[PDB]
């Protein structure tokens, strides 16, 4: 009851989404990924090219701070650093909250952390 239909779209920097599905606030959109397939590569693209329209939709929300939250649930040696070095590309490491869970970290905290 407290929600209502959103309608302010964002630039994901991938054309295909912002035409066909239209990724708006308060909406989920899982990115299905196979096993033997990358998952990391594609994810990074959405994180450094996530940005509201300034008035291309008829308005912005750039007037209020945009920020990102992260939380990984099981990551190796490469996926650890790979994410961190693209967050310095993002320029966000002073306005983000990271809840990294590794595989060297307990297996029980893989469902707590979410």
């Amino acid at each position: 009851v407290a929600r209502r239909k959103p309608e302010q779209f964002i630039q994901t920097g991938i054309s295909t989404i912002d035409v066909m599905n239209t990724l708006v606030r308060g909406q989920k959109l899982p990115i299905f990924s196979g096993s033997g397939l990358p998952a990391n590569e594609i994810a990074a693209q959405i994180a450094r090219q996530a940005t509201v329209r300034p008035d291309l939709s008829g308005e912005g929300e750039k007037e209020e701070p945009f920020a990102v939250v992260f939380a990984a649930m099981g990551i190796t040696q490469r996926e650890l650093s790979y994410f961190i070095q693209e967050f310095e590309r993002t320029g966000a490491l002073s306005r983000s909250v990271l809840f990294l869970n590794k595989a060297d970290d307990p297996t029980i905290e893989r469902i707590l952390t979410p």
Binding site: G91, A92, L93, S94, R95
Partner: protein, 62 residues
Amino acid sequence: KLEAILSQEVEAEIQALLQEAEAKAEAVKREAEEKAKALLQARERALEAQYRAALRRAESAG
């Protein structure tokens, strides 16, 4: 006369050829200006990028 025919078969070729080669000497030179301009257009954007990134980094860092 007959020598006046001879001067006209030449005088025709030697303007066709030299008009053609003053429009290749134009053409190469037009593309040469339009390239140097564009290799500096990409240089202009690059520097800007590096400054917009740079300042954001120093704001976050601090």
